[PDB]
Each structure stands twice: as structure tokens, then as C-alpha cells.
Design a binder for this molecule. Structure first.
Ligand code: NAD
Length: 171
């Protein structure tokens, strides 16, 4: 079953109210139905509604940001997104990564200030760190958009145009 065209994965502390919100609106203007979580959530494990939303999405757009790996919920959602890209067919789950002011290699290799996040995870999350690294490394190896300082409105326009074209070709 399919409900959304795009599941928007992002680190709220970094881009909730600014870049990802403008990206969310641009996707809507193109007729791309997008799930952008805005609910208050608490607890240890990721909310099941988010995992369910990923399963019912034709694709996921990941807004990688400096502190993305500092949130277990973002990493857990990424693991689900990549398990979906690999295992799901009819329809497939496309994955569009956006490196928002982060070096793509910092995400792929878990290096730089982006990689420092894994020092804060202890042995309570030993079993998780390998699937987290693998999901990050895999996601960073899909054709995306490295975004450095620049006119964001144009960056988002090119990104959502390319996603609109790719999703229409997948249908
Ligand atoms: N999947 C891709 O489209 C892509 C593109 C470039 C590099 N890479 C990864 O980086 C490694 C090294 O690449 P290189 O030797 O060409 O030099 P490099 O690491 O400098 O990358 C070349 C250019 O591609 C950009 N880039 C990196 N990851 C990207 C991605 N996922 N989507 C779009 N652009 C991306 C970089 O910012 C850089 O401008 C490769 O072995 C691969 O794992 C992947």
C-alpha cells in the first residue's frame, strides 16, 4: 500500500523550521505528496507511525545536516529507509539524499563533526551502531545533492524538479 510520494527525513534541531520547511512546500507545489512529521513525540524507540509512513512512501528525501547522526530517531528511520530501498519492489523505494551544509564524505565515512555523534553512543547501542553506519554509508552512495552556501530557493527548485521528474518516471 502507498500513501505518500516522499517521506521527509531530517534533523529537526537543524532544519525543521527553515530549509526542510521550504523544501516541504516546494514539493507540495509540484503535486508531490509528502509526509513531514510535525507531531510531538516522546519515548525510547522510534514512533511506529514513522516506520509505517516510510513503508507507505514511494521514496524518501533525506536532509542530512551537521547533527543528523546525533539523533537515534533519525538513524533508526534511516535504517528503515535503506531496508526499504533494498528489499521493497512493486513499487520500489527511491532515496534522494541532500547533504545540507555537510560534506558528503563526512556522512559516508562518519567523519568530521558529523562522525563525532557516534562517540556519544555507548555499549547500550552496540548492536545499533553497525546498522547505523551501514545505513549512512549506503545512503551517501546514492546520487544526491551536495548543498554548500548558496541561493537556497534555486537549490530547492532544482532538487524538487529533479525529484518530480524521477518519481513520474518511476510510475
Ligand atoms: N553516488 C554518487 O553519485 C557519488 C558521487 C561522487 C562520489 N561518491 C562516493 O564518493 C567516493 C569518492 O568519490 P570521488 O573519488 O569521485 O571524489 P569525491 O569524494 O570528491 O566526490 C566527487 C564529487 O561528488 C560529490 N558527491 C559525493 N557524494 C555524492 C552523492 N551521493 N551524490 C552526489 N554528489 C556526490 C562530492 O561532493 C564531490 O563534489 C566514491 O567512491 C563514492 O563512494 C558517490
Amino acid at each position: 500500500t502507498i500513501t505518500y510520494d516522499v517521506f521527509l527525513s531530517f534533523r529537526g534541531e537543524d532544519t525543521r523550521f527553515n530549509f526542510t520547511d521550504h523544501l516541504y512546500s516546494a514539493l507540495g507545489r509540484r503535486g508531490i505528496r509528502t509526509f513531514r512529521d510535525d507531531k510531538l513525540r516522546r519515548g525510547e524507540a522510534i514512533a511506529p507511525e514513522l516506520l509505517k509512513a516510510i513503508e507507505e512512501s514511494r521514496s524518501s528525501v533525506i536532509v542530512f545536516s551537521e547533527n543528523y547522526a546525533r539523533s537515534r530517531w533519525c538513524l533508526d528511520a534511516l535504517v528503515k529507509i535503506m531496508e526499504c530501498h533494498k528489499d521493497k519492489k512493486d513499487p520500489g523505494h527511491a532515496v534522494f539524499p541532500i547533504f545540507y551544509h555537510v560534506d558528503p564524505s563526512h556522512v559516508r565515512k562518519q567523519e568530521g563533526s558529523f562522525g563525532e555523534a557516534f562517540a556519544g553512543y555507548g555499549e547500550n547501542l552496540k548492536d545499533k551502531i553497525p546498522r547505523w553506519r551501514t545505513a549512512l554509508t549506503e545512503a551517501a552512495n546514492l546520487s544526491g545533492w551536495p548543498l554548500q552556501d548558496g541561493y537556497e530557493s534555486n537549490q530547492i527548485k532544482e532538487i524538487t524538479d529533479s525529484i518530480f521528474r524521477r518519481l513520474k518516471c518511476k510510475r
